[PDB]
Design an enzyme around this catalytic site. Structure first.
Site, PDB file in Angstrom:
ATOM      1  N   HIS A 147       1.162  -3.606   6.578  1.00 35.56           N
ATOM      2  CA  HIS A 147       1.958  -3.522   5.143  1.00 35.56           C
ATOM      3  C   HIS A 147       3.181  -2.707   5.526  1.00 35.56           C
ATOM      4  O   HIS A 147       3.589  -2.165   6.255  1.00 35.56           O
ATOM      5  CB  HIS A 147       1.193  -2.938   4.087  1.00 35.56           C
ATOM      6  CG  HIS A 147       0.954  -1.437   4.296  1.00 35.56           C
ATOM      7  ND1 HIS A 147       1.993  -0.411   4.396  1.00 35.56           N
ATOM      8  CD2 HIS A 147      -0.181  -0.654   4.609  1.00 35.56           C
ATOM      9  CE1 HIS A 147       1.630   0.768   4.702  1.00 35.56           C
ATOM     10  NE2 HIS A 147       0.108   0.694   4.967  1.00 35.56           N
ATOM     11  N   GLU A 198      -7.580   1.428   5.273  1.00 41.81           N
ATOM     12  CA  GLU A 198      -7.152   2.208   6.455  1.00 41.81           C
ATOM     13  C   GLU A 198      -8.392   3.497   6.740  1.00 41.81           C
ATOM     14  O   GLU A 198      -9.263   3.539   6.018  1.00 41.81           O
ATOM     15  CB  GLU A 198      -5.898   3.086   5.974  1.00 41.81           C
ATOM     16  CG  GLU A 198      -5.354   3.876   7.146  1.00 41.81           C
ATOM     17  CD  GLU A 198      -5.251   3.284   8.295  1.00 41.81           C
ATOM     18  OE1 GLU A 198      -6.073   2.658   9.243  1.00 41.81           O
ATOM     19  OE2 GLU A 198      -4.197   3.269   9.085  1.00 41.81           O
TER      20      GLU A 198
END
Lengths: 193, 193
Positions: A10, A82
Site C-alpha cells: 500500500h 501486516e
C-alpha cells in the site's frame, strides 16, 4: 505454471514515512500515498495480467490503495494483514533497538504479537492460496511490507529469517513466477512513482 | 553504507532468445539487443547514481551494451565473465535435461567448465570488489545472467544454490543495498524496454 503471483504494498502513510511499525492500527494514506496507489494501478495496467483474482488486506490503507489503483477486489482477508507488532506497534527500529540492540522482526518477532513461526505459517497458507488460482489465472495480493516479503521469501522456499534480504517500499510491486521448474522471484522494487 | 551495487545484464543475442547457454562464445547483440541496451542506459540515467565506477565483462556483447547504454567503462575484467559452461556451451536446459534430468547450473555446475565452488568464490571476490568502492561511490557491474544472479545471491549471503530463485532477463537491472545494517536486494527485474 504459465501464471504469476504479484504483490502490491500500500501507499505511504504518516507512520511509514517515520519508519514506525504499523500493524492493526488504522492509519490513513497521505495525499502522496493516494498518488502512489494511483500510479501503481497505472503500472499494473501494462503488466498484461490474465483475468487476475485480487486478494486484499482488511486495513483501510490497503483497501484504499486497491480502489485508487483502479482494481476490483475479489477477496478481503486478514490472511494478508501486516505482521502483528504487539508491544512494538508504533515503534521505529532504532527505538526498538534501545531495548533489543540486535532486533529484526525476521529473527525475533514481536512481544505480545506474532512470532516468526506464526507468520511463517500464515505466509505459507498465502502461497498455497495463490497456487490454487494460478492454475487458471494470475494472482494479485494487495498487502504490507513485511508480510509481502514473508510471502516472497516463502515463495522461493527460504527460511522466513531471509525476509530481511528483500526490500518492499510503499506502493512497490514484486512478482513471483517460475524458471525451469523452480519457484522464482522475477521482479522486486518495481515503482511507478 | 550510503551507496549501492547495480548490475546490468547485456542485451539479447541470437543464442539467448533460444535459451542456449553462452559462456566464452562471442555472440553478437541482435538489433533488438542494441535497442534494449540503449533503453537501459536511459533508465540508468534517472537512477541518480553517485560518480559510478563501471566494471564490465570482457565479452563483446557486454562491452557493446555498456557503450550503447552510454556508459564509460572504468575496468574490464573476466571477473564478471559468465559461468564457464564447458561441455554444455551452446546447449539449452531441456537438451541438458536429456542427460541430466534434474540439472540446474546452481547445484550441478558444468562438466569441463566452472564448478559451483569456483563461481561461488568468483562471486564473493566480485562482492568484495564492490564494497571497496562503495565506501565513496556507487558501483555498476555490466555482466551476465547467471553470474549477476551469483553476485546477488552472495550479496544477500545465501548459498550459491539459491541463484535459481532470482530472475535476470536480458537488459535488466538488479540493485543491491542495505536496510538497518543488513545487505539486501532492493530492485530486481527492472526493465526499460
Amino acid at each position: 505454471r504459465n501464471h504469476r503471483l504479484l504483490l502490491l504494498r500500500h501507499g505511504e502513510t504518516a507512520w511509514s514515512t517515520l519508519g514506525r511499525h504499523t500493524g492493526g492500527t488504522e492509519v490513513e494514506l497521505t495525499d502522496t500515498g493516494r498518488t502512489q496507489a494511483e500510479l501503481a494501478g497505472q503500472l499494473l495496467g501494462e503488466l498484461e495480467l490474465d483475468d487476475p483474482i485480487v486478494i486484499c488486506s482488511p486495513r483501510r490503507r490497503t483497501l484504499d490503495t486497491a480502489k485508487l489503483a483502479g482494481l476490483t477486489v475479489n477477496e478481503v482477508t486478514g490472511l494478508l494483514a501486516e505482521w502483528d507488532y504487539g508491544s512494538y506497534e508504533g515503534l521505529t527500529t532504532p527505538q526498538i533497538r534501545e531495548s533489543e540492540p540486535d532486533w529484526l522482526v525476521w529473527t525475533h518477532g514481536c512481544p505480545a504479537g506474532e512470532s516468526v513461526a506464526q507468520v511463517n505459517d500464515r505466509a505459507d497458507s498465502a502461497v498455497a492460496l495463490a497456487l490454487e488460482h494460478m492454475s487458471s489465472r494470475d494472482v494479485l495480493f494487495v498487502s504490507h511490507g513485511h508480510f509481502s516479503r514473508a510471502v516472497i521469501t516463502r515463495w522461493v522456499q527460504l527460511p522466513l529469517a531471509e525476509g530481511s534480504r528483500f526490500a518492499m517500499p510503499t506502493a512497490s510491486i514484486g512478482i513471483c513466477g517460475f524458471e525451469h521448474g523452480v519457484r522464482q522471484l522475477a521482479v522486486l522494487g518495481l515503482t511507478g512513482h
